[PDB]
Amino acid sequence: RPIIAFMSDLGTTDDSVAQCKGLMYSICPDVTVVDVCHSMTPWDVEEGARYIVDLPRFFPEGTVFATTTYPATGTTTRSVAVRIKQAAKGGARGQWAGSGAGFERAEGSYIYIAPNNGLLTTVLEEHGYLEAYEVTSPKVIPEQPEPTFYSREMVAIPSAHLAAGFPLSEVGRPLEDHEIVRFNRPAVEQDGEALVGVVSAIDHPFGNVWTNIHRTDLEKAGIGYGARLRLTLDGVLPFEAPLTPTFADAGEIGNIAIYLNSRGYLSIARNAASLAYPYHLKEGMSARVEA
Amino acid sequence: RPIIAFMSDLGTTDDSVAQCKGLMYSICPDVTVVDVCHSMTPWDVEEGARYIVDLPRFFPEGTVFATTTYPATGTTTRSVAVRIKQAAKGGARGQWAGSGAGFERAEGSYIYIAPNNGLLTTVLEEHGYLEAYEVTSPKVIPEQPEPTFYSREMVAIPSAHLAAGFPLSEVGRPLEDHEIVRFNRPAVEQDGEALVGVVSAIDHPFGNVWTNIHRTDLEKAGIGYGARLRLTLDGVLPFEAPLTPTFADAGEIGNIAIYLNSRGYLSIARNAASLAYPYHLKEGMSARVEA
Amino acid sequence: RPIIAFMSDLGTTDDSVAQCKGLMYSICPDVTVVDVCHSMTPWDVEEGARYIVDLPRFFPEGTVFATTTYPATGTTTRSVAVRIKQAAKGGARGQWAGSGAGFERAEGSYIYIAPNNGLLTTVLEEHGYLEAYEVTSPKVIPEQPEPTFYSREMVAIPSAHLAAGFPLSEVGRPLEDHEIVRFNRPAVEQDGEALVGVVSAIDHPFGNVWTNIHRTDLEKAGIGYGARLRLTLDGVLPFEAPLTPTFADAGEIGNIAIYLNSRGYLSIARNAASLAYPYHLKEGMSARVEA
Amino acid sequence: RPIIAFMSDLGTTDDSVAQCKGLMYSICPDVTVVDVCHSMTPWDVEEGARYIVDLPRFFPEGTVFATTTYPATGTTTRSVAVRIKQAAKGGARGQWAGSGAGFERAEGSYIYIAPNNGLLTTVLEEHGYLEAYEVTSPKVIPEQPEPTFYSREMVAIPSAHLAAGFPLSEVGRPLEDHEIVRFNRPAVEQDGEALVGVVSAIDHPFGNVWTNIHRTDLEKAGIGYGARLRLTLDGVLPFEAPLTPTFADAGEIGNIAIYLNSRGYLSIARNAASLAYPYHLKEGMSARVEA
Amino acid sequence: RPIIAFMSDLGTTDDSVAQCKGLMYSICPDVTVVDVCHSMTPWDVEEGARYIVDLPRFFPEGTVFATTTYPATGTTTRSVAVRIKQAAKGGARGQWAGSGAGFERAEGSYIYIAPNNGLLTTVLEEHGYLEAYEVTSPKVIPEQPEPTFYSREMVAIPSAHLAAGFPLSEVGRPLEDHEIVRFNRPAVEQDGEALVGVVSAIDHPFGNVWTNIHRTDLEKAGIGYGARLRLTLDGVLPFEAPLTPTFADAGEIGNIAIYLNSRGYLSIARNAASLAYPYHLKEGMSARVEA
Amino acid sequence: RPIIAFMSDLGTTDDSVAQCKGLMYSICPDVTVVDVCHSMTPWDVEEGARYIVDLPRFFPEGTVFATTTYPATGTTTRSVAVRIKQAAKGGARGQWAGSGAGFERAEGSYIYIAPNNGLLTTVLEEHGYLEAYEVTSPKVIPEQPEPTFYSREMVAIPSAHLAAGFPLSEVGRPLEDHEIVRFNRPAVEQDGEALVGVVSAIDHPFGNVWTNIHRTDLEKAGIGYGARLRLTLDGVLPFEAPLTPTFADAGEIGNIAIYLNSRGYLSIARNAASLAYPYHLKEGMSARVEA
């Protein structure tokens, strides 16, 4: 029952993803390929990271995550395959996914194969890893790899091999922690009683506004459900609401809610209407929260 | 060979759909998940209805349709699961689908699971149903559901359990008919010789115009195949043609044709050209027809 | 593991594709359906041909290609099914796809099924074919096809039967080469010591400019890696650079690279930046090249 | 997935069984056919029952037992198809079979199909049944059955339809418990402090002797492990020994051991030597035990 | 879904058959090997013929029949492969096999492969054939065959290739009819109103007596069900019984029945008791029948 | 595609093997179970050895050989699982099995699992081994094994786990060479010019006589094909014939042939007739050869 969950910047308007899928089913005959999304901004490793960090707990043990945008295609720079440690609990609260109490997952049950460009920064940060290797072996990549299509050559093809049970440690040499590339991110800043962050994403197609202020940052200022909040966007736009668990807790359609999203971050939205689209609110704008 | 066909307002640009899927494969490992589409206007129940009403006859018996947009997420509202009666004969004229004489479907062979928010209105009206239940069991939903992601918690997760053979009647108590929320289907109003209707959809990506005027509406006022027809849109733009089967019957590329769509409503289009896009014609415009 | 690769003009915004997939699973329960893409410009056969031509070397032998845009729906015109000859060697060097030396594909291993409207022009040009038949038999198409949906009736349905092992030569009469429709392909013309051509596509979502000038055309001019080049677009915009293997060989992020793409064509791009989008460069602009 | 386990009196020296197996693959192409044995004494239903009573706990759920000796072939009699109740814990202590703590089987997971001549007597005594039906529908048996081959016609063929998923209750009319034939079973009689029974089988190829005296029959006389016992066979030959778990607990090769077999019955044997054969001990000799 | 049905004189007491099977799976991984029998009397082609002649109608179309006893192992003799024409109807009345009306089989649908030593005589007589080839290709046999195991080298290995889809006509040169060895078949002789044949087999494990006098011989003599018959065996045993369809019509257990076996031949037996065994009746004893 | 090849002393007259196969299918649903044989003399390890020693080359790599005769059942004695090194060449010549030049088999591609009672003595001599383990883990055996059926509990069940891909080294502690029991192998003795051995087996159903004098015993003593030989059985029957490759090279049916068998060992037989049976020759009689 092997599965590959597939995330790229290849787009949905041509045959790029199909080329990758064909090779996958060739290497691992009865694999299931699951598309995450393929429409991220090319080269934005920070954005791709967001689409893959919370994946593991939803998926059956032994899932291979094939995640790629490949700015430096055709250079010396290679792919990293890693085995993660803890399929982290996620969510507003911090639980497993599934019916009942949830589906608890065993340690070291997921592999990520990605270019070594920092795409995995937040995966390693939240899940840890037990082992990591550079992907070099003639058995899992082409001997003459196409210079313009490294997602196919250096990610898709070897993810399929992994999926089929080609042993992880046989793909190439082990990498020291310092050889695995990370991007940097400003942390949530404190300002007395105030937390200062950024709008990290607009949640499409709804136009909810996700921040980088996490519950653990909030409850650092002793902030939890019911707290009467002021949340300033773009430095000039206050917004006052109490911290609620959902959209409908604001009353009337169109009314403002400040809440915790399903990845656990502080968000703002309207009840059954768009917040972000009418006022052109954007990823990148400042976000401050206070009691 | 269990199948879940999946429709949502989740979008195609993030990991939301993938999370649902992972759970689907976690619950029912042998399942095939088929995308319907994920790009409907959020909170537009009438639009989502349109994409799910015709599904059943095309699919193998035993298929679960997981269809969701969840405006009321995090509240007390619970999903409804229904066994439909008839896989209604369709086409533009009334038939089974498939090669030969088409594949006949036994009654009672499909299950829809959806928020009780009206999404199933046209499904129930076109197919009828044998049994309906509230989805409340912790055997098929989380004991602790995520307040802002009910499509995943209350539709995706239980559909998989239904797909895997969990007995329909164990998911929760049976619902009486009026407990199933309906949206209103405003009637085609008679004025003189003319039927005062509406454009119910633009058929993308061709840009044909679909109306809410059924054969039995034109039949009620005499109108049938071969009649010369005056259709006015938005109270401004007129068109005139005989009722025909396909777009090429109109003659030259770009010629207007008026027909019955592959589901039986009065439609209009150009031949191998777009009618809607160059004149900015929209869903919601008034549509009047006279002979 | 029979596979169907599916390319249509049906869009990603309604239930059209799902109707096709449903029938595909009804006819051939073990089938794996792989989406190529579904978002081509309606009635742009040259555009669709582009997304299907390079497909075959990537899939396991036996794969059926279901490829469809049906301008002439509901008329006399029937589909053509072809067993191709060579699964060609593609890319900037010309080789097999996959790990190792690649995956060698036996001759006559692939079937295409398409409207006889010229969609398969570059497929027949590049792979050749061994047999070709008109798809007319009631065992493989509906006895009464829906007039306005020929992709479902004349392509998807019979593709599934073919995937299931229905003998190719039984779908209808064999076709002589002259009965298979082609579109015109603009030649490369001469003026001074310069190959004159055209921009054949914008590579989305990167903004890369792909021309129709083949490596074999440059090889006739005496041009391999490292020759300074004057490439003019639209008849006013000039560019200058040597032929290099990848984007990184331009130096600075934003610098011009002139390369051969993963299909083997003269192309122009920016290193980790977009060329086409900022200057509104388009499929169809003149493309003149000189050393 | 689907399994048929087949036990017959057809022998192993001709094509009888292969004619059946071929019909099984014709009807259910995915089936796996497991031979139980085919060499029972023709018309000896007590012997045939022995080879099938303990079958269920060992096989995956859904498995079908095709079990036949048909002395009444060509007459008005029909087979009975039964869904049994519990896969009832077996062995010299009672437990599920398998690695770890064994494999748990849900109730109602198995189907036996057999002539209604008493073959299933001990199956129904030990496992119970939830439902039972006469096999008469022409959907599952030949319209014109071979008169002298009822094993193939009324057992094999319909066994395959059941394995394929035909509804049990659609094979024929339900049977009241009294319509199901049973053979008479020798009771364990009491004579002073002693239990008088019978030799129920010789265990080939080891020459072990099995009696019809159960662990439960012994618990009544206050007999468990380590009790010194005397056993008289055929009315002439006596033996004396304690009750031990295994053969090697007797010491010397060839030493007498008295134990409970893998079904929990009072047995007698020699340690890695044959008891029955040198002495011509036979199924059906009197068997008397006393402390 | 490819199938090999395997009949040999290899015996059941060693690894000989496992050796052939392992090769069979090596060549054709997806294959199902179905045992006919392996216990025939070595070098008795007439007996091996009886076990293979009635096989085709019970098996799915495409079945390869691998049938071998090889007295001439290690010489210049080669195997023969044949495509049979008609999968003949059989049984007491002459019908297709299976439920309902039984499963009709297409012409040209089975392949037999055997040493050219006469084993196929009755097969070719009953079914005819469309093509016959000598088996000599180094693609289907070893380049250096084991001199004493031609059943493995020249039947088992090639059958696997055939079942794998290797083209029949490529195995070697086509054979003319008289190149295929036949053994002599002694005719049933007419004697006034009587028919004079022989006992062709004892039907194990029951000890029913099978003659070579076919139903078409009987009906040519005016004999049919309900005819009062004298059937003299061994010259001196004038049995008397009506020709009845089955054993039970004889009445009491042990009573003599004269019937037509599942091959359509005149037979004699006891109702639920053995005829051959207690009186030592054997293959080769004269059989005369008359009203 | 996993295979268990299965050899035992369980017999074919009851449900013992069926019990083992059901557990095999429970554990590894997609396994194909191949019967070697089940009719060896109980407790005779020398004989079981013979049926398993030549297996490897004929089978697909990854095959698990489940081989068992379990005298010391119920004790502390445990099963040993071994990964062999060399899938040795065999036959008279010394080659690979299969068509063409044969199918070479990679090093360490087969696993044997057997009681530690010496059944593997000849497997390890012929094949070598890379790793050997005591089978003890509750992951691969029952926590409470049935004391009279260790073949099932300690061989069958764990062989299924190994076929299912449970890591070899995790069944229990590694075993040193001297912890692996072997039986005695009294050797071929040189008597000046004579070689003195023993009749190692009578080849059923043919009654050919196999010695333990190998081809290397002969080629070392300058005896190859063509040699005029004197072969003395029982110390008193001095047969005389040339060394030929096959039976038919002796001329007339019934004639005496001295040859090399398919295992490579010196043999005597008749051409198309039995040597052993008429004269009651036996396994264990003396066997002297000389030129």
Cβ atoms F102, F96 nearer than 8 A: yes
Instruction: State which of B185, B220, B252 marks the end of a domain.
Output: B185
Kindly identify which residue of chain D lies nearest to residue E63, measuring between CA atoms. Answer: D22
Peptide bond into A2 cis (omega under 30): no
Kindly identify which residue of chain D lies nearest to residue F141, measuring between CA atoms. Answer: D99
Distance from the Cα of C42 to chain B's closest Cα (Å) equals 6
Provide the b/e sequence for C158-190 (b: ≥16 CB within 10 Å). bbbbbbeebebeebbeebeeeebbbeeeeebee
Cβ atoms E87, E105 nearer than 8 A: yes
Contact list in A for residue C247 (CB cut-off 8 A) is 73-74, 148
Based on the fold, state whether residues D64 and D156 are members of the same structural domain.
yes
Kindly identify which residue of chain E lies nearest to residue F254, measuring between CA atoms. Answer: E71
DSSP string of B189-251?
EEETTEEEEEEEEEETTTTEEEEEEEHHHHHHTT--TT-EEEEEETTTEEEEEEEESSGGGG-
Residue B180: which CATH number?
Answer: 3.40.50.10790
Based on the fold, state whether residues E203 and E145 are members of the same structural domain.
no
Cβ atoms A67, A113 nearer than 8 A: yes
Binding-site residue ranges of B for S-adenosyl-L-methionine: 9, 14-16, 70, 151, 203, 208, 262-263, 270-272
Alpha carbon dihedral E230, E234, E236, E241, in 10-degree steps, equals: -20
Q: Do B15 and A36 touch (CB under 8 A)?
A: yes
Instruction: State which of D131, D165, D185 marks the end of a domain.
Output: D185
Nearest CB to F22 within list D7, D59, D203 = D59
Cβ atoms A205, A256 nearer than 8 A: no
Nearest CB to E37 within list D14, D140, D158 = D14
Q: Do C73 and B98 touch (CB under 8 A)?
A: no
Query: Distance between CA F282 and CA E252 in Å, rounded?
Result: 47
Cβ atoms B124, B180 nearer than 8 A: yes
Beta bridge partners of A229: A241
Cβ atoms F66, F156 nearer than 8 A: yes
Q: What is the 3-state secondary structure (H, E, C) of E183-241?
A: CCCCCCEEECCEEEEEEEEEECCCCEEEEEEEHHHHHHCCCCCCCEEEEEECCCEEEEE
Strands (E), chain F: 3-8, 32-35, 64-68, 79-83, 111-115, 131-134, 189-191, 194-203, 208-214, 228-233, 237-242, 256-260, 265-270, 286-290
Contact list in B for residue A94 (CB cut-off 8 A) is none
The single-letter DSSP state of residue E247 is G
Domain that holds residue C192: 186-291
Was D212 annotated as part of a binding site?
no
Based on the fold, state whether residues D179 and D190 are members of the same structural domain.
no
The single-letter DSSP state of residue F147 is T
Based on the fold, state whether residues D30 and D148 are members of the same structural domain.
yes
R_g of chain A computed on alpha carbons: 21
The residues on D that touch E, with CB distances below 8 Å, are 9-15, 17-23, 25-27, 29, 39, 41-43, 71-75, 138-144, 146-149, 157-158, 161
Was E208 annotated as part of a binding site?
yes
- Chains D and E form CB pairs within 8 A to the count of 122
Instruction: State which of F130, F164, F185 marks the end of a domain.
Output: F185
Residue F15: what are its φ and ψ, rounded to 5°? Answer: -100, 10
3-state secondary structure of F285: coil
Method: X-ray
Cβ atoms B119, B45 nearer than 8 A: yes
Residue E157: what are its φ and ψ, rounded to 5°? Answer: -65, -60
Contact list in B for residue A259 (CB cut-off 8 A) is 147-148
Amino acid at E147: P
Q: Is F63 exposed, middle or buried (CB count within 10 Å of its CB: 0-12, 13-18, 19+)?
A: buried
Cβ atoms F139, D100 nearer than 8 A: yes
Based on the fold, state whether residues B33 and B136 are members of the same structural domain.
yes
Distance from the Cα of E215 to chain F's closest Cα (Å) equals 35
Provide the b/e sequence for B180-194 (b: ≥16 CB within 10 Å). bbeeeeeebeeeeeb
Based on the fold, state whether residues D108 and D205 are members of the same structural domain.
no
Residue C176: what are its φ and ψ, rounded to 5°? Answer: -70, 145
Kindly identify which residue of chain A lies nearest to residue B154, measuring between CA atoms. Answer: A99
Query: Distance between CA E79 and CA E155 in Å, rounded?
Result: 7
Instruction: Centre a 10 Å sphere on the Cβ of residue D229 and count the other Cβ atoms it contains.
Output: 17
Contact list in B for residue A203 (CB cut-off 8 A) is 14
User: Which subunits sit against F, judged by 3+ Cβ pairs under 8 A?
Assistant: D, E
Nearest CB to C51 within list A14, A23, A75 = A14
Task: Tell me, in Å, the resolution of the deposited structure.
Answer: 2.5
Comparing CA positions, the residue from E286, E278, E217, E208 lying closest to residue E250 is: E208
Binding-site residue ranges of A for S-adenosyl-L-methionine: 9, 14-16, 70, 151, 203, 208, 262-263, 270-272
Instruction: Give the angle D35-D41-D43 at the CA atoms, nearest 5°.
Output: 105
Based on the fold, state whether residues E235 and E180 are members of the same structural domain.
no
Amino acid at F275: L
Q: Do E9 and F205 touch (CB under 8 A)?
A: yes
The single-letter DSSP state of residue D209 is E
Based on the fold, state whether residues E162 and E196 are members of the same structural domain.
no
Contact list in A for residue B139 (CB cut-off 8 A) is 99-100
Distance from the Cα of F104 to chain D's closest Cα (Å) equals 30
Residues contacting D233, CB < 8 A, separation 6+? D199, D209, D239, D268, D281, D285, D286, D287, D288
Binding-site residue ranges of C for S-adenosyl-L-methionine: 9, 14-16, 70, 151, 203, 208, 262-263, 270-272
Question: Number of folded domains in chain D?
Answer: 2
Q: Do E59 and D9 touch (CB under 8 A)?
A: no
Instruction: Give the angle D202-D203-D205 at the CA atoms, nearest 5°.
Output: 115
What is the maximum span of chain B, computed from C-alpha positions, in angstroms?
61
Per-residue CA distances from B84 to B34, B80, C165, E172 (Å): 19, 12, 33, 59
Query: Distance between CA C35 and CA A21 in Å, rounded?
Result: 9
Percentages helix, strand, coil for chain E (3-state, rounded to 5) are: 20, 30, 50
Beta bridge partners of E113: E66, E81
Per-residue CA distances from C264 to A14, A201, C90, E137, F275 (Å): 17, 38, 7, 42, 73
Based on the fold, state whether residues F166 and F49 are members of the same structural domain.
yes
The single-letter DSSP state of residue D169 is G
Based on the fold, state whether residues F179 and F198 are members of the same structural domain.
no
Query: Distance between CA C259 and CA A73 in Å, rounded?
Result: 13
Query: Distance between CA E239 and CA E281 in Å, rounded?
Result: 13
Instruction: Give the angle B169-B171-B176 at the CA atoms, nearest 5°.
Output: 65
Amino acid at A110: Y
Query: Distance between CA E80 and CA E77 in Å, rounded?
Result: 10
3-state secondary structure of A190: strand
User: Which subunits sit against A, judged by 3+ Cβ pairs under 8 A?
Assistant: B, C
Was D109 annotated as part of a binding site?
no
Residue F199: which CATH number?
Answer: 2.40.30.90
Which helix (H) or strand (E) covers residue C150, if one does? helix C150-151
Chosen for mutation from F6, F15, F44, F141 (greatest number of chain D CBs closer than 10 Å) is F15
Nearest CB to F245 within list E71, E74, E142 = E74
Contact list in D for residue E50 (CB cut-off 8 A) is 14
Where helices occur in F164-258 by DSSP H, the ranges are 215-219
- Chains D and F form CB pairs within 8 A to the count of 116
Based on the fold, state whether residues A192 and A126 are members of the same structural domain.
no
Q: Is F150 exposed, middle or buried (CB count within 10 Å of its CB: 0-12, 13-18, 19+)?
A: buried
Comparing CA positions, the residue from F55, F52, F1, F56 lying closest to residue F29 is: F1
Query: Distance between CA D271 and CA D249 in Å, rounded?
Result: 8
Beta bridge partners of D66: D6, D113
Per-residue CA distances from C184 to B81, C119, C121, C188, C283 (Å): 54, 11, 9, 13, 16
Query: Distance between CA C255 and CA C271 in Å, rounded?
Result: 6
Based on the fold, state whether residues C131 and C226 are members of the same structural domain.
no
